[model samples]
Each structure stands twice: as structure tokens, then as C-alpha cells.
Target: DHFNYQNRLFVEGLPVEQVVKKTGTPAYIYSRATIERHWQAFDSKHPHLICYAVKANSNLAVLNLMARMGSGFDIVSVGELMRVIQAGGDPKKIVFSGVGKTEIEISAALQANIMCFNVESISELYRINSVAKALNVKAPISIRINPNKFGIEIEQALDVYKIASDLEFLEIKGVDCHIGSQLTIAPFIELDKLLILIDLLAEKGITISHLDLGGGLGVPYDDEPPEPAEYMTAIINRMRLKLIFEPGRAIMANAGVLVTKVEFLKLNDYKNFAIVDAAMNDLIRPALYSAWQNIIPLNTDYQDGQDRPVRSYDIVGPICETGDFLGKERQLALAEGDYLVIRSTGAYGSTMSSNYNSRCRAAEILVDGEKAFIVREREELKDLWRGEHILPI
Candidate 1:
């Protein structure tokens, strides 16, 4: 276990407090071992095509590591596409899967030669065919089934399916039926129907290779989610054929944490507020989704503030809104200047972060064994206004 409790919080081999001393609190501490561990865990099951949903962590270093491991990426837009290429990822393994694909975006993916474009619109599907023809390259593509502002409707799916051929430049890869996210239960309804559709397509002489399950698998923010083996069992039992599963949260959520120190302990008759240095800007899942993360003291033998009572406190941030909270009702023996580690922050915590309240983002430290490197340096004060200026100065 890379992230474990050894007297106190240890990310791999570095204690939370020691890391804070080097980089300061309000930093996202990542474990290289943990990242490799979870990814390999999925690989050991041997789908062999586990696509890393880039929404999890787009940091170049993180992507570089993932790419080096030979894992494919499930990207949404042009920026992610460029980032993947920049990280030296295999374009043959990259699949473009999301809504809102502009002609420019489609052209970009086609140019980059990404694996598959999961189509949402019938009109855009036509656009892809036209764009590929214009570029004179066959564009690999997939269709979203009964999904979002995304996907063709049942009444029109067949029409478009038959119609996609008329355009003549698009290579229809397969069907993508990613129903929901953070789902503990993996149902087979969408998949079962799609397989029949696959056989139906076979009956009509239209063959498809792989089905993109996309990302829906959940992880423990507070409690346990289903294991990857359970999902493996389900997928293998069906046809045991080609499939692509994008794991965004499952592989990354517990791989890192937000380490911040308590700046002030405000005691009131009604309640207590542990104002931490890390804010919603650093990790906003707690505020935006009302997502709860485990907040623990950096010291297990916390005896510093004269043996203070362990009390329930709202671990909050400096942002103006009441929603700017990292955790609520956390029971800890806290003191001013004591480092606190927020758990399960490796997923959307930092990536979903912002420069809100003009707060510069936190540094991201990726620890391997006993060595730590600042993968992302903490933004400076002037960075907030770096791109803006007075009107006519």
C-alpha cells in the first residue's frame, strides 16, 4: 500500500508533515507506486485495452507515466488530444469519446489519427465523413447508444446507422453505451441489448470490433465500490470479445491526497471551524458536488496543543461562498499549523480545481519510494492576474 498509516499519513515513504515542510501544505501529493499499482491491477485481469479516461488526471507527468505503461486514453476534446500526443501517447490507442465535437475538433482527431470517435450527433457523423474525405483519411468512429445530447435516438438510430454508409469516409468502429458514473452496481441491460444489436448487425453483414464501455465504475470516497474483477467477470461472461473500459475514478481516486495545514481553529458555542490552508480552489469536488473526503491529522500522536480534545469541526477553506468546504463534521485532535491530509483526492479534486478567489493552485508532488518531485509547481500570486491588465494603461 503506497498510501498507508505508519504512525501517521505516509504517501509511499514520505510522511505528510515532512512533505509539507518541503513543499508546504495545500499541495496535492501523488504516489507513483499507487498509480502504477492500480493500473497494473486492471491489466492483470487482461482486458489489455484499459483506456485511461483523461478526465482523471491530465498532468503531463501523469499522462506520460500512463502512456509509457501502454494504456490507451479516453479523451473528450482537442486540448486533451493535444496533451495525450504531447505526453508521447499512442494515437492508435486514443479514443475520442464525449459530446460537443466541433468540425475543427473532429478534424484535429482525424489528423492525430486517434483510434475512435464516439459519435453523438447524426449531423456530426456526416460532418466526420465529409471531413475525413476532405483530409483523405479514414476516420475511426463509434456510436453512443441511448445516451446524452450525445447519441442517436432509437427512432433515428437505424436511419443514421444505415445512413452513415452513404457518407462513405467514416469507419464505424462499435457502440458505446456508457450509462452512468460512480455506479456501484454494474448492470448488463445496455450491454445485453447492444450485443444483440451486434449479432443483428452481423446478420445484416455489418461487423463491429470493440464496444467502448466508457467510464462509470466507481471508487470509495467514503465506502467500497465493486472490484474490477467483478466487472471483468461480467464482461468476459458475455462474449469475452473485444471491449474498451475507461476507468477515470477507479484507477486514480485513491492514488493521491490533498495535504493542507490548519491555519486557525475557530471555536464557537454552536460549532467549530477548522480553517485549512487548502481551499475549494485546490480541490472543489467537496464543494461543487458536496463530495465528502476523509480529513485526518498528519500526526497520530497529536500531543502538541496541551492535549486538546478531539472535537467535530467543519474543515473549511478561505473562499467566500459557504460551499467552499473540503470536509464537514470531521472529528480530529487538531491544532494550528498541524498538517491535515484529505483522502481520495487523486480523482477530480485537483483537476476540477480553479483560480477562484484569485487563489493560485497548489503544487502537485509525485512521490516515488522515498524520493519526491514537484510535478506541478504551486502557482504564484502574480499568476492570477498574469493575463489581465488595465484598459488603457
Candidate 2:
């Protein structure tokens, strides 16, 4: 009932306008309840480790919430591993994913005692061994079998496992299905077919502990991708070994939004441009992929309930690029300084944001009912040059 306060868009119990007051425009607001609900969807009736994919949104506060919920993490870099560590996430629950994990990263993960490493290639397998050998610890690993890419080929996996099993510092724990993202049941069903290789490995006396589906489960982004419950059911129907799911966008995407103020509305015969304060430096999904996100006014009663006829405007930023737009021809009744909510930007929005055009990145706010916590402060112009020096003169 309090989803929208007095006809104004709200998160928890606070109005979006009220939350914006603390952080100003061009900010991200996340609902703790929404995030918990999404995480619950994937965790319910499933006993496997739900490693919240960190690359989706690696904010310390977000990571902390996932940790507090007893969730694990699927991290790609040492940076993410550090974030998870600082967030108080259990290192034992962390499963390291992605290729290009350098010796330092591998060393860091080994020291953290992470659950497993999703090894991408034969060379990477060797690299991890050397790092673990130096640490005098065995690195728990999972061979990522891609169906050509960073992972070992399906045919090469058996031999790779044989080699890995013999390595003193490399401990094979699971099979990382480096297959499918933004996925459907077809790839998952196909993955089940690939499990015959697990049988093959068992024949070689290599019994796998779990199957790590390297977190590509899709979320509802316009297209109604499979939900976690139904999707898990599909896997559970055939799953024999323990399972590990790394879900990123699916849990975070629906829980947050990018709120930006309309700077100026340029009405022209050719086009109507609602130049906003937020830019590709803030949320790049639209400019990057021409991605669509619903843009609605913060206080719709001021616009929608009035006699304002909706006008189609290109919601753009001040960035000096043709690709600098949030939404193309989004129909909305708008005025200068009116805040608009760019819907469903929680996942890749801030994590992928940059300080392009010298614009400071947006602040992030996590709301729990009436209280709005400033998880990240909005950057200032000085922040753009924090680490840079002028010629050292």
C-alpha cells in the first residue's frame, strides 16, 4: 500500500523525492525488501549455495546485505573479493569465477580460502597450481567447460581433470558450466546432456562435489525470462550432485532505480530532447546497447494527474557523445527540474558507471522503510581528479 506515497513514487515508506533530497538527483535508490524478495526467489526450496554474483552491483552496502542474508558471493576479481571481505561475507562461501585471474588474484583467493575456482583453461589451471604451491595450500577448483571461449573444451575436460588431479596444489571440486547467459531452459537442458561427462569423470575415479552453473540465470528485462523457482525445478529434475548458482542481474536488477532530474526540455520540430543531469557516466545501458528502461516522474500527481499531455522526448545527458542517451523517445509529461525514475537499473547501472566527461558519478541510497541510508556519497568534480597529478611540477 505504501509502494507509492501520496501518488509519488516511493521506495519502502519514503518518497523518491525525500530520498533524493539526501543524495540529490542522478542517484540510485535500492529497496532492501525488493532485494530480499529476489534473493528469496532463488534460495527458496533449494539447498545449494546461492552465490550472489558480485559483478552485477559490487557496492559494499549491497554486498553487506547479501552477506547478512546468509548469501554467498561469486566474485571475478580480487577487487570484488576484497569488497566481499569488507562486507563481512564468508570467504568459505565465496566461489571465484571469471578468467584473467592473475597470480595476485589467485594468491588472494587461496589465502581467503574460497570454496572453488572456476578454472577457464589448461594454462589457467597450471597458473592456479603455481600460486597455490607457493602458498603451500591446495586450491579447490572447478573446470569451466565452455560449449569455445575461456573454458576448456568439453572433449578436453577429461584429460584436463586427469592432469589437474595429479597436481599437488590443485583440488578439483566441481564442474563450472561456462554456458549460457540471459538464458533459457534450452541451454540448461543441454547442460544436463553434458553431465554424461561427469559420468565419464567418475569413471576416471574423479567424483565431483558440485556443479557450478557460472551464474547466467536471466532476469525479467522486458522479456519474461524464466524465474528462479521454475528454473531451479528444471535443473533439480535432473540434478544429482550438489549445485551452485551464481545469479547477478536477476536478483539486483528489479530492486533499484536511477533517479535523475530533467535539466532542460528542448522542444524542436525534429526532436524533443529532455536533457537530464544523469549521463552515460551515470547509467550507460541505454547509450551502450540502446537498452530501454521505463522513465516515470517522481511525483506523477504533479504531471499525470494534471492536464499535461504526454510528450515523447529523447531522455539524454549532457555528455558530448551521440551515444549519450538514457532512453529514446520515452513518452512523459515533464518540466525543467522534474526528477524521473529510470526503472530497473540496480544491476549493471552503477557498477558499470564511469566518470566520463568529468561528471561525478551518482550517489547510491539504500532504503529500509522510512530511513534512507546513503550507501555511497555522490562524487564531486574534485573526485574526478583524486588520483591524477598535473605533470608533477
Candidate 3:
């Protein structure tokens, strides 16, 4: 019953087997219908400008899809900005956001004249001002505030906002506040903090044109995510700021799956280990953040009604790390060579992969109805080592 969203698409007639045959296993598969429906539902109610946080997937295919749908880009690094532009996203529609913005990054963003820069600190504002001065352009800027006046993880963002608001170096056009990533609920904690920040700004006579209640609209990678409209409606009703949502996972996690082949099914005295080609290097959620991703087998006919045939497994990869794993205690009836799709990986999966153990990253695909196209191609071993420079003997 529990599978990555790929099973849903396959159940609806998109052949998962053929897709694997064409695109290869250990690849990311996304459903266009699911993506469109998710965005439509969110944009329908909020009708606010939505920016897809590029760090979520950053694949050209994913970014291109978002751009085609008229969504904006939220980038944390200059590389992501390049990704957006390369993906056919308009530079003017991009919002630059991050904490440690370097001189090069600030200058690049300022030169691009993006929609706005989500300033994270006073020092960053000073840097942006210098860059803007050098370019002879008034950089439109906003502050990323940490509004939790009390204890929270990213409490420093509030201090950054307050300092930026008081500074005269940059054109303060807006205020940005995010309740960190993967927030389960719209805690009145953040709402109350935002109201207080707004009140402070008003009392100080500081005028802000835009208010970016940045997105951390978390979805249940292993559980059901909050309905987009439901969480967003709650936010709209609570805040008076000019709303902008930089949702990454909430919009794309469910829409995609990572397809991997089970290479071996090893049984010990009391446990099973499903050795997979997909590693923590491919989809690091489980190993990195201890994040949960749903793992399921494609062929369900093998499922016996009685639970005895189904066994729990520590689905792991060939990576050198001892901790490389997809799911722990995953209950499934899987044989070697069977394809298992990792659920909700559309967001952080590929974006986090690396060339660890000299293994290249997997490819990605976007499935439209019965047609599944390769959005990204799998990298060869050479592709992973292409940029190496060995010392001359």
C-alpha cells in the first residue's frame, strides 16, 4: 500500500518497467501531472507569486518545468542562478536568498538585477551596496528575518533583519522571514513573531514594499504531506505581508521518485539487507538528515496476503560509507534485480548526490501521462572524473 508516487503513475498506465529499461534504474522519475496539480492547487488559493526553491531539485528539467509554468526561482547560490538561467528561467524573475553571500555572488546577483535580493545580514547589505554602487544600480533588497523573538534554530535571521532595516546602505524594499525548512505546521510562533516584527518596522517608520514569508511548507516524505491549499490558506489568513512562497519539497517531493534496482537480497539470522545500486550518494536523505523516504517494490503480484512473506530490510547501497542506506525496517517482498522506487525524492535526492567513491550521479526523467522523457542523463565514470587535475610526476 505504501510506495513512492511512481506506483500511482504506474498504476494509472505509465509502464514503470519500460521507463526503467529506457532511462535506467538508479534514476529519478517525476510525474508532470502531479507537479502541475500541486502547483495549480497552491497557486489557485494563494494566487501569490510562487518561487520554486532551486536547491530542492535544481535539475534543468525540474527548473525548466517550473519556468514553463510561470513560476519564479529562489536561489541560494550563484551556481543556482546560473542553473535557473540555463534552464530558461528569466533572471529578472529570480529572488536571491542565502546567509553567507560572498562578494562574487553579491556582485553577480546585483549585475543580473534580479527581482530582489533576500539580504541575510548587515554585512551582506554593505557588500551588496558596494556592488550596486560599482554597477551604478540601486539593488532592490529585502531582509531575511528570524522572527522568533524566543528560542528557535535560525534565531539569528531576526537579528539580521533588524540590522538590515536600520541600515541606509541598500534600498530596503522588503522583509523576508522563513521558519526554517521542513516546518510541519504554520506555528503561531512564527506568525506572532512576524506580527511583532511588522509592528516594530511600522513603529520605526521603516517602509517595506514586499514581505516574503519564505516557504518551509514541509511534506511527509514517509507520511502524507499537508494539503497545499490547507497549509497555504492558513498562512494567508494569518499574515498581512505581501506573500511569496519559496516552496521546494512541498511542491515537488511527491511528484517524483528515484528508481533503483535491488542487486541482492541478503538474509541474516534476524534481518534482511536489500543491496541496491542507489546509494546515500544518490539519495542521501536517509543517511544525511536521517530523513524518511518511502521505498516500495514495483511488482505487487508477488505480495502474499499473509505478512510472513514480507520482511523488513535495511535497504543499503554499494557506497563505501557504513551508513549508506535508503530505508530501515522497510517491509517489502522483493527479489534481487527487482526495481524499488524511492518516494518523495523529487526534492532533495539528486540535489544532494556527490561523486563519492568515484560513482557518478543518476539521471532524472519527467513523465507526462504515458510518455516519460529523460530530463537528465546519467553520468558516466568519465563524467565524474572529467575535471580532475593530477600532480605531474
Candidate 4:
């Protein structure tokens, strides 16, 4: 079973016991089959490109697998663009998106000849044009219109496309819109509003071939998120244009889990605490977004040769802040040295990890078929302070 428990937890066919024995505690365990299953859900529905958002889980093994499977990328920074290339991703399959992209980053994107730049501002559109002029290349562009309060007005988009049509070294390809993140409901793409913009642009003699519906398809964390097929239907049924999706969480969140070892159980002021070795620095979504992640004990059937007792306890880490917790008021029967798997962490888990409180990040293991491989090694203390200096004169 894939991440199912019979007696002991298992990721794919390999038992969690075998993984913990080889890799120790506080490691990210991901199933390759899970990743493939999620991607195929979107891929099977439409013939359009499913650009895996790079900011979710940037593990080289993950990237390499996606690249091997011909999945394009949606990157926000030059660093992410480089990661795609380093992972054997095609530069032509990359779409660069961000509001405050630097000129240097644009220059780098141009050099790499990425598929498109999801331009957030008119100023950014002009900036990219200038960069492309210098490089003597036509930059494939997409205007990222905000559909929310912070977004550009639909009228404003018309004027911007008119200006873009006159630009020398920029080629407008599509329109991009990303409303928000971790959205549980099927996104209402406002086809009426989008159609209005499309018609207005047609009047201005500017045409867009593709419609990039930026990904916010939420995955099941504490609640049931809408399926990928539902989101695709919302877009494709209304608009008959070429579609592009930048799914980050929907494809990754459920595919992996964070396994941490229980350090101690303490009782304070009528409150119970289960301290784990993994800190907020290793997985910050709970601390950052107050996110809820399902925590279950490994070896659930063989705990001290008896079923472990479940009680309300705050699952916390070694991080200093009181908010450095994985789950609050969780009913878990955890003992010292026992393992707890934090579920739905494959997306924002390690990518958002930090070196805060001087804690080294955890390692990542990707399980393929009947075997497991270390995708990312656990960070060493020396690696954390590798570039630091003591004010040497």
C-alpha cells in the first residue's frame, strides 16, 4: 500500500520501518507514485500544459521526475529558473512569474529563452521589452491580471494590451490570473469578466491565444479540497482557449509526509505537550499560516505491544516561540522515541523551511517502486554556518 498502514506504516511497498532504519527521524518521505497519480489527474483531463509550480517542492528528485515526465514549470525567480535547468528541465517549458522581478532576472530569463513571462505590471512589461531589445530577441509575454482587490482593473488590462501590442521585442501570448492560494472551492474564473476583457482586446486589435489560469487548487489538509478535474471543468467548459495550469499544492501536498520523532511528553498548567525533534524551521506552515496537518503515529499497531492511548496534546517542536507547533490540541498517543508522521506536507513543507533558531533542516527521501533514495540530505550544522564569519578584521 502507498502510505497505508497495516501493522507498520509504509510509503509505497517499502515499510516505514525500513526507511526509518536507513534514514533516521525527522525526514520527509515522498512517494513517486503519488506524485505521478496527482499529475496524471490533471494531465489526463486536458491536453494543455500543466506547469508544476516550482515554489512548492523544489527537490531535485521531484524536479527531475517532472521534467522526465514532460511537465513544464511556473517559476517566480531566476533561482527557480536555474533550478529547472539544472534539473534537466527545458528552458522553453518554463514560465517566469512575479511582480518585483529584477532587471538582472529578466536578462537571465531572456538568455535562457523561457516560454513566457507572466508580467504583473505595465512597468514590468516595458522593462521586459527593454531587456529583450538588448538581447535582440522577442520575449514571449503574458499579462497577469489581478482579479481581486489588489488586481488591475479590467479596463486597465485593455489599455495595457494596447501598449503591449506596440512593443518591439515583446510578444503577447496569453493572460494570467492567480487569485490566491490553498483555495478549497473550485475557482470561479469569472468567464463573463474574462470574456469582456477578451472582446475589448479584440477591438483593440490585440489577440491572446492562451488563457493561463494560475493555480490555487487546494489539497485536503484538514478538510476535503475540490478535485483537479472539477477545477479544469470550471475553466475549459466556459472558455474554449488553450489552457495552462500552475498547480503547486494540489499536485504535491498529499504525496509526502514529514516523519518526526517524539522527544518528550510534558504536562504544564493542565496542558499536555508532545515535543518532537522537527521544529518550525523544518516545516513552517503551521507556524506561518496556522495550518492544520494530520499527525498520526507510525507503527500504530505495535506501540509497546499495545494500542497507544490517544489524548489531547499540543504537538510542538524545539523552536522558541509558543506558536512553533505542528498541531494544537491533537489527540495522539505518542511516546518518547516514537515516530509521528505529519501528513499533507509535500507542498509547502520543506520549500518554506528556514534556519531559524539555528536548526538544520530535515532530509527528504523519495520512494520509487520497491526502493527509496535520499533526495535531500539532512543539513549539517557546519552547512548552516558555512558562510558566516566572526567580524574578522
| C-alpha lDDT (0 to 100) for residue 359 of candidate 2 | 86
Q: Please, what is the TM-score per model?
A: 0.95, 0.95, 0.89, 0.96
As for lDDT, the candidate ahead, 1 or 3, is: 1
> How big is the RMSD of model 2?
2.0
Per-residue lDDT over 77-108 for candidate 2, one digit per residue giving the tens place of the 0 to 100 score: 99999999999999999999887889999999
Please list the C-alpha lDDT of all candidates, in the order they appear: 0.82, 0.86, 0.77, 0.85
Writing each residue's lDDT as its tens digit, candidate 4 over 283-358 gives: 9998888889999878766636643567789999998999799989998776677889999999989999999988
RMSD to the true structure for each prediction, in A, is 1.8, 2.0, 3.7, 1.8
True lDDT of residue 3, candidate 3: 23
lDDT of candidate 1 over 294-350, digit per residue (tens): 887776776554656789999998889999898898888877877888888988877
lDDT of 3 by residue, 1-393 (tens): 122244232723476777888877788888887787777777873336788889888988778888898988899999999899899998887888887788898888877778888876566778888877777788888777665331222445445555665555567777676776786664623566656666677777677777777777888765544677887777776754566778888888887888899898889989899999999888888988898887877766643343335788999999877789888998887777778888888888889898788788898888876777888888987787686899999
Q: How does model 3 score by TM-score? A: 0.89
Highest lDDT, which number? 2
Worst-scoring 10-residue span by lDDT in model 1: 147-156
Colliding residue pairs in candidate 4: none
User: How many angstroms is residue 347 displaced in model 2 relative to the true structure, after the best TM-score fit?
Assistant: 0.4
Cα deviation in Å at residue 159, candidate 1? Answer: 2.4
Off by over 4 Å in 4: 45-47, 148-151
